[PDB]
RNA sequence: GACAAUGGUAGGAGAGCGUUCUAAGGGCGUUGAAGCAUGAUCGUAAGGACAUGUGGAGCGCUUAGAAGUGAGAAUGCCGGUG
RNA sequence: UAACUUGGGAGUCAGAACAUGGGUGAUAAGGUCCGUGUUCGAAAGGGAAACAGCCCAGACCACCAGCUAAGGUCCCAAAAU
RNA sequence: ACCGAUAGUGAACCAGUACCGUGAGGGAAAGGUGAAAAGCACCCCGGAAGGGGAGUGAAAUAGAACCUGAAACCGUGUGCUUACAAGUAGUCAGAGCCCGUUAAUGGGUGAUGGCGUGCCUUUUGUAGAAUGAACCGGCGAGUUACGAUUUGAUGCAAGGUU
C-alpha cells in the first residue's frame, strides 16, 4: 500500500514555528530558519542555566563586598572571618541580609572581626 | 488464543532496521557505509575473494 | 520504475553550461511523473510449515475450544430442505453465541444452504477444518460422525 | 523577624506566613514540616548560629507537592549529526511558614 | 451604521491602487470624492466608482444620510494575476505580471 | 527559591559627591570614580540599572602623573580620513583641556554599553576649585 | 551587479517610507462650491476668477 | 535501601514514537467524522489529549500482521509566491 | 579489573598541532620523514583578548547552594589598591 | 492488506491533443456548486465589470475550475515598543505598560545588563571569503526475488523434510 506524505509534516513544522513565536521577521515565519533558531535557543538555554548560577553568585559577592566596605572590611577578610567563626550563611543570604537589615549584618561583621 | 489477542512466541520476531531515515537512528545519511570509496557506492564493492 | 514509465529516452539538456542541475531523463525518480524507486512488485506471501506443526495447530485450536467449553456435539442435522429460519431456531435452542462454526462429517448441502445467510455462522466439514475458522468462531457445533472423523484424522 | 533555614542543599530566608518553594520533601500535602537547621535569626533579637542556632526551629504547612514548569533540554554539535532532546520537570514542595521557633 | 462596496479584479496593480486609497482613507465622503476627481492617477476613477456605489447602497439599502458619511475603510487586496511574457534578446523570454486588485470601500455614519 | 533583590528606578537614590583631584594620581582617582559612577559601592548594586552616584571632579588641572608621562604618554585619535592621526601628550592635554583628560581617563574605565555611556554622563570635571552645582547639594568624598 | 542578499520586508517598507502621493492642491470654487485645483479653471461650472471660461 | 556508571564522529547493539493498509475485538459520528485554525495541555524523546472556531461524512481505540512508512539541503523535479 | 577463544556486524587506510629523541632542510618553515607522550579529530566547560591541536578539566537532568583547578584579585571585570 | 488527481496509464478532463521540430520524433497542463438548478424575480450604484440589498437553498460565509481551503506572499486596524544606536537577531537576567488562561509558583510586549560568528556538506582544520539552498508546499534514495551464511523462535529427533 502507498503512504502519502499526509499531515505529519505540517504538524511537526507548525510545532517548530510556534516555538519560534516572537522572533524577528522570517525567523518566526519560515520553518528552516525558525528550526535553526530554535536549535540555537536550546543550546543557549542549556549553556545559560549554568551561566546563571555564576552570574548570581557574582552579584551576591559584589553586594557583600559593598556592605563590608561600608563596615571598613574587605569581602575577602569578611569571608575568612565568617569561616573562622563557623558561620555558614551563604552569599545569597548574606546579600539579602545586608540589603534588608543592616544591624544584623553589622553583628555578623563583628563576629567575623572577632574571629580574625 | 483469539484473533484480537494474537501473540508470537517471545523472541520470534524483530523489527527490521531501516537506514537513511534521520540521524537519531544512528544509520541516517551515509546509512552505515561510512564516507566515500568504492564500498560507499550503490552497487559498490569488489568481487568475493 | 524509470524503465517502465513512457518516454524519457533523451537527455533533457546538455550536461554542462546551462546552469541547471544535470539530468539524464525526464522520468528519473526525483522528477514529477518519474519512475518509482523500488515499490510494490507482484509476489506471493504464502509459505509452508512442517506437517506435524500444521496438525499440532489444528489440535491446539480444537483443544482451546474444548477447554473454553465452546464445543457442542449434536447427533445429526436432519435438514431435508434449506431453511435459514429453522437453522436459526436450532442455533437458538442450542443457545449458541453469535459466532458459530458448524462441522459436518461430509458436505451437507442443506445445512450449508440453511446456515449460509446467517451472519456469524460458518459451515465446514471435518476435512475442511482450519485454524482461522476454529479460532474465529466462539463455539463449534459438530455432529457425532464429524467428531469421530476428526478424531480419526488428527 | 526572619530566619535562614537550610533545606534541599540551599538556604532560604523566611518570614512567618510566607510561601516558599523547596526541593521535594518527603511529606504529604496538609502535613506540618519542621526545619531544624536554622543558621540565623534576624529581627528584634538577633541570633547567630555557628553554624546552627541551637534549638531553633521553623514550622510550616505543606501546601503542595508539584512539578516545575517543563524545561526542554536541547543540545547539538553542528556538522556532526549529533543532538539530544530531553524533557525535565523539577519536583518541588510548596509550604507556608507558620512559626519561627 | 456601515455600507460596503467592492470592485473585484480591477486590472491595476494593488501597489498602484493603494497609493490612491491612502489619500482617502478615513476622510469625509464629499472630500474623498473631490480628492478622487482631482487626483491624476489611473486608479482614481475606479476608486471613485467604488466609493459612489458604497454611498449609493448606504442611502438606498440602509437609508443612511450620505452627507454625514466618512470613508471608514478603503483597501486593495490582490486579485488573480494574469501571467504574460515579453520576448527579450537572444531568444529569451521574461515574465510579465499583470496584477489585479479587489478594492473595498466601507463608509460609516459613525453611530 | 529565587529571592535576590533587584533595584529599579522606583527605589534608586542617587547622591552627588565632590572629589578633589589636586595632588591625586590620575589613574587611581579614575578607577575609584568609575566605581562610584557605576554604583559598585552600594549594596543594592544591580547590573541592568544605573545605581551609581553623581561625581564632580574639581581641580582637574592639578592632577599629577608619575614617571615621564607628562611628555611620554601620548593620546592618539583618528579623524577617519586617510593619514588622519592626531596626537597630544598627557602634559599638553593637562595644560589645555584637563577636563577632557580626567573625563577620558575615567570613561576608559567604564563599559562601552548604553548603560556605561549613561553612567559616564553623571561625571562633571572642572579645572578649578569651583563647580556650578551647589543646587544639587553635593558632599565631599574622601578617596580610598 | 546583482543583489547579494534578498531584501527583507522590513528594509523594503523602510525604503518605501517616502514613496507616496499627496492630496491635490484644491480649494472650494467660490462660484459653485465644488472643489477645484487652485489656479485652474473650475471644471464643474467652468468659472475662473469670477468669470465663465 | 545502598553506590557505580551515563561527552562523542564513522560505526555496532537495544528500546521506542508516528504514517497508510489488513484481520479480529470493542467503539465514535449530522446532538457534527476526517481535514484546517487557535490555545496558557500532557509525556524523558519521537510524540499524545482536551476545548473552541471552521468543515460537512467519515474515523478512532486494542492486539496482531504488512509496508510506496517519516526530508532541510541532491546548482534535486513540479507548482505557487517573493 | 581485566584478559583470552569462537562466531555475527562494522568503520578506518588524507590525519593536525604541541612537547621531546632523531634524519633531511639552512641546529629555515604553521616544511618534510620516523621514535615517544598528550590533546584535537570525535570534547562542551574555565584560562591563554579573540584563538581545533597550548594550560586546567571530561557536560545524565534540574537549583538564584558550597569547595577548588589553571589563571587571577586598581577600573572595564568576580576576588588583596 | 494495488493508486486515489504531483498518485494511478503520457492521457479520470474532446491526449498522442495543445505545443515544439524540415523530419524521424518529443510531448504536457487541466477532476469536485447543490439532495434537487431550486443557477439569484425585483430594486439600487455603474457604460460594462463588479458590488449592496431582496430572494432560492440546511448552507451562497455552496453563485460557476462554485467541497475543504495549509504555507509562502500581500493588505487594514490595533496592545506593547522603537529616532545616541555597532545587532548570526537568540538566550539568561529584568523594571515599566497591557491583558486574563487547558488556573498554571499565568499570557503579550520589552528600558536595560551578561553570554553568543546560521545550517548542511567536505575536511587535519570551515564564521568561513570552500559547497548547496530565494521562500513555501508537494514529490524525492538499502527494495524485492532466488540462493548462501549466521542468530533468535518453533516442531520433530537418530532422524528431519518433501
Ligand atoms: Mg513529503
Ligand atoms: Mg559551578
Ligand atoms: Mg544497526
Ligand atoms: Mg532498533
Ligand atoms: Mg554515531
Ligand atoms: Mg556499517
Ligand atoms: Mg556523502
Ligand atoms: Mg576519505
Ligand atoms: Mg570506507
Ligand atoms: Mg542560479
Ligand atoms: Mg506516475
Ligand atoms: Mg554517552
Ligand atoms: Mg518514502
Ligand atoms: Mg607539518
Ligand atoms: Mg605533509
Ligand atoms: Mg606525535
Ligand atoms: Mg576526521
Ligand atoms: Mg576546546
Ligand atoms: Mg573567553
Ligand atoms: Mg561524564
Ligand atoms: Mg572587583
Ligand atoms: Mg490509498
Ligand atoms: Mg486535493
Ligand atoms: Mg502526466
Ligand atoms: Mg493526469
Ligand atoms: Mg472552495
Ligand atoms: Mg534613544
Ligand atoms: Mg541533515
Ligand atoms: Mg584543505
Ligand atoms: Mg557559506
Ligand atoms: Mg566541490
Ligand atoms: Mg547560492
Ligand atoms: Mg520548499
Ligand atoms: Zn465652480
From Swiss-Prot, chain A:
PANTHER family, A to Z: 39S RIBOSOMAL PROTEIN L20
Protein name: Large ribosomal subunit protein bL20
InterPro entries: Ribosomal_bL20 (IPR005813), RIBOSOMAL_L20_CS (IPR049946), Ribosomal_protein_bL20_C (IPR035566)
GO biological process per UniProt: ribosomal large subunit assembly; translation
Protein origin, superkingdom: Bacteria
Stated role: Binds directly to 23S ribosomal RNA and is necessary for the in vitro assembly process of the 50S ribosomal subunit. It is not involved in the protein synthesizing functions of that subunit.
Regions crossing the membrane: none
Keyword vocabulary terms for this entry: Ribonucleoprotein, Ribosomal protein, RNA-binding, rRNA-binding
HAMAP family listed in its UniProt record: Ribosomal_bL20 (MF_00382)
Stored CDD domains: Ribosomal_L20
A GO cellular component annotation in the UniProt record: cytosolic large ribosomal subunit
Family: Belongs to the bacterial ribosomal protein bL20 family.
Keyword rRNA-binding: yes
KW NAD (keyword) present: no
GO molecular function: rRNA binding; structural constituent of ribosome
Gene that produces this protein: rplT
Swiss-Prot record, chain B:
GO molecular function, a single term: structural constituent of ribosome
Disordered: annotated segments: 1-49
Gly residues bias spans: 42-49
One GO process term, biological-process aspect: translation
Alphabetically ordered keywords of this record: Ribonucleoprotein, Ribosomal protein, RNA-binding, rRNA-binding
Binding partners and assembly: Part of the 50S ribosomal subunit.
Function field: Binds to the 23S rRNA.
Protein name: Large ribosomal subunit protein uL15
Source organism: Staphylococcus aureus (strain NCTC 8325 / PS 47)
Gene name, Swiss-Prot/TrEMBL: rplO
Swiss-Prot record, chain E:
CDD domains: Ribosomal_L22
Keyword Cell division: no
Biological-process GO terms, alphabetical: translation
GO MF terms, alphabetically ordered: rRNA binding; structural constituent of ribosome
Signal peptide range: none
Keywords for the protein's UniProt record, in alphabetical order: Ribonucleoprotein, Ribosomal protein, RNA-binding, rRNA-binding
Gene3D superfamilies found in the cross-reference section: Ribosomal protein L22/L17
Quaternary assembly: Part of the 50S ribosomal subunit.
PANTHER family xref list: CHLOROPLAST 50S RIBOSOMAL PROTEIN L22-RELATED, LARGE RIBOSOMAL SUBUNIT PROTEIN UL22M
Function: This protein binds specifically to 23S rRNA; its binding is stimulated by other ribosomal proteins, e.g. L4, L17, and L20. It is important during the early stages of 50S assembly. It makes multiple contacts with different domains of the 23S rRNA in the assembled 50S subunit and ribosome. The globular domain of the protein is located near the polypeptide exit tunnel on the outside of the subunit, while an extended beta-hairpin is found that lines the wall of the exit tunnel in the center of the 70S ribosome.
Name the record gives this protein: Large ribosomal subunit protein uL22
UniProtKB/Swiss-Prot annotation, chain G:
A Gene Ontology molecular function term of the record: structural constituent of ribosome
InterPro entries linked to this entry: Ribosomal_bL32 (IPR002677), Ribosomal_bL32_bact (IPR044957), Ribosomal_zn-bd (IPR011332)
Transmembrane feature ranges: none
Stored Gene3D superfamilies: Single helix bin
Coiled coil: none
A GO CC term attached to the entry: large ribosomal subunit
Keywords linked to the UniProt accession: Ribonucleoprotein, Ribosomal protein
Superkingdom to which the source organism belongs: Bacteria
Gene Ontology annotations of biological process type: translation
PANTHER family: 50S RIBOSOMAL PROTEIN L32, LARGE RIBOSOMAL SUBUNIT PROTEIN BL32
Entry's family note: Belongs to the bacterial ribosomal protein bL32 family.
Name of the protein this chain belongs to: Large ribosomal subunit protein bL32
Gene of this entry: rpmF
Amino acid at each position: 500500500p502507498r503512504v502519502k506524505g499526509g499531515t505529519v509534516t505540517r504538524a511537526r513544522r507548525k510545532k517548530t514555528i510556534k516555538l519560534a513565536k516572537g522572533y524577528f521577521g522570517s525567523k518566526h515565519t519560515l520553518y528552516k530558519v525558525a528550526k535553526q533558531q530554535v536549535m540555537k535557543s536550546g543550546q543557549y538555554a542549556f549553556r545559560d542555566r549554568r551561566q546563571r548560577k555564576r552570574d548570581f553568585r557574582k552579584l551576591w559577592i559584589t553586594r557583600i563586598n559593598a556592605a563590608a566596605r561600608q563596615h571598613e572590611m574587605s569581602y575577602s577578610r569578611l569571608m575568612n572571618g565568617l569561616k573562622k567563626a563557623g558561620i555558614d550563611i551563604n552569599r545569597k543570604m548574606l546579600s539579602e541580609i545586608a540589603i534588608s537589615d543592616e544591624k544584623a549584618f553589622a553583628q555578623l561583621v563583628t563576629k567575623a572581626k572577632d574571629a580574625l | 488464543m483469539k484473533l484480537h489477542e494474537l501473540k508470537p512466541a517471545e523472541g520470534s520476531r524483530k523489527e527490521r532496521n531501516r537506514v537513511g531515515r534521520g540521524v537519531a537512528t544512528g544509520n541516517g545519511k551515509t546509512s552505515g557505509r561510512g564516507h566515500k570509496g568504492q564500498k560507499a557506492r550503490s552497487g559498490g564493492g569488489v568481487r568475493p575473494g | 520504475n524509470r524503465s517502465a514509465v513512457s518516454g524519457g529516452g533523451r537527455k533533457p539538456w546538455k550536461q554542462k553550461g546551462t546552469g541547471r542541475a544535470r539530468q539524464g531523463t525526464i522520468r528519473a525518480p526525483q522528477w514529477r511523473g518519474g519512475g518509482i524507486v523500488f515499490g510494490p512488485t507482484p509476489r506471493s506471501y504464502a509459505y509452508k510449515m512442517p506437517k506435524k506443526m500444521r496438525r499440532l495447530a489444528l489440535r491446539s485450536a480444537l483443544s482451546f475450544k474444548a477447554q473454553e467449553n465452546g464445543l457442542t456435539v449434536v447427533d445429526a442435522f436432519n435438514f431435508e430442505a434449506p431453511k435459514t429460519k429453522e437453522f436459526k431456531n436450532v442455533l437458538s435452542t442450542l443457545e449458541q453465541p453469535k459466532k458459530v462454526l458448524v462441522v459436518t462429517e461430509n458436505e451437507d448441502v442443506n445445512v450449508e444452504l440453511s446456515a449460509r445467510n446467517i451472519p456469524g455462522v460458518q459451515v465446514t466439514t471435518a476435512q475442511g477444518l482450519n485454524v482461522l475458522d476454529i479460532t474465529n468462531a466462539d463455539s463449534l457445533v459438530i455432529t457425532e460422525a464429524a467428531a469421530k472423523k476428526v478424531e480419526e484424522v488428527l | 523577624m526572619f530566619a535562614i533555614i537550610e533545606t534541599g542543599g540551599k538556604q532560604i530566608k523566611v518570614e512567618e506566613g510566607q510561601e516558599i518553594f523547596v526541593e521535594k520533601l518527603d511529606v504529604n500535602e496538609g502535613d506540618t514540616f519542621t526545619f531544624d537547621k536554622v543558621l540565623f535569626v534576624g529581627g528584634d533579637s538577633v541570633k547567630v548560629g555557628a553554624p546552627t542556632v541551637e534549638g531553633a526551629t521553623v514550622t510550616a504547612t505543606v501546601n503542595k507537592q508539584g512539578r516545575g514548569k517543563k524545561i526542554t533540554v536541547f543540545t547539538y554539535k553542528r556538522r556532526k549529526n549529533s543532538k539530544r532532546k530531553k524533557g525535565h520537570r523539577q519536583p518541588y514542595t510548596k509550604l507556608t511558614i507558620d512559626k519561627i521557633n | 451604521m456601515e455600507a460596503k462596496a467592492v470592485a473585484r479584479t480591477i486590472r491595476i496593480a494593488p501597489r498602484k491602487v493603494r497609493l490612491v486609497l491612502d489619500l482617502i482613507r478615513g476622510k469625509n465622503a464629499a472630500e474623498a470624492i473631490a480628492i478622487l476627481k482631482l487626483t491624476n492617477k489611473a486608479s482614481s476613477p475606479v476608486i471613485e466608482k467604488v466609493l459612489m456605489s458604497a454611498l449609493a447602497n448606504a442611502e438606498h439599502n440602509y437609508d443612511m444620510n450620505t452627507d454625514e458619511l466618512v470613508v471608514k475603510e478603503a483597501y486593495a487586496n490582490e486579485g488573480p494575476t494574469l501571467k504574460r511574457f515579453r520576448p527579450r534578446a537572444q531568444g529569451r523570454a521574461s515574465a510579465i505580471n499583470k496584477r489585479t486588485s479587489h478594492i473595498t470601500i466601507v463608509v460609516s455614519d459613525g453611530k | 527559591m529565587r529571592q535576590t533583590f533587584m533595584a529599579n528606578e522606583s527605589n534608586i537614590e542617587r547622591k552627588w559627591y565632590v572629589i578633589d583631584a589636586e595632588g591625586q594620581t590620575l589613574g587611581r582617582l579614575s578607577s575609584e570614580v568609575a566605581s562610584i559612577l557605576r554604583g559598585k559601592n552600594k549594596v543594592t548594586y544591580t547590573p541592568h540599572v544605573d545605581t551609581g552616584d553623581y561625581v564632580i571632579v574639581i581641580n582637574a588641572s592639578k592632577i599629577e602623573f608619575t614617571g615621564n608621562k607628562e611628555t611620554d604618554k601620548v593620546y592618539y585619535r583618528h579623524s577617519n580620513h586617510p593619514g588622519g592621526i592626531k596626537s597630544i601628550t598627557a602634559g599638553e592635554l593637562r595644560r589645555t583641556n584637563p577636563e577632557r583628560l580626567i573625563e577620558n581617563s575615567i570613561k576608559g574605565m567604564l563599559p562601552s554599553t548604553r548603560l556605561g555611556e549613561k553612567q559616564g554622563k553623571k561625571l562633571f570635571v572642572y579645572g578649578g576649585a569651583e563647580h556650578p552645582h551647589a543646587a544639587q547639594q553635593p558632599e565631599n568624598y574622601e578617596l580610598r | 551587479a546583482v543583489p547579494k542578499r534578498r531584501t527583507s520586508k522590513t528594509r523594503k517598507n523602510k525604503r518605501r517610507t517616502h514613496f507616496k502621493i499627496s492630496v491635490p492642491g484644491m480649494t472650494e470654487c467660490p462660484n459653485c462650491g465644488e472643489y477645484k485645483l487652485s489656479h485652474r479653471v473650475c471644471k464643474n461650472c467652468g468659472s475662473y476668477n469670477g468669470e465663465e471660461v
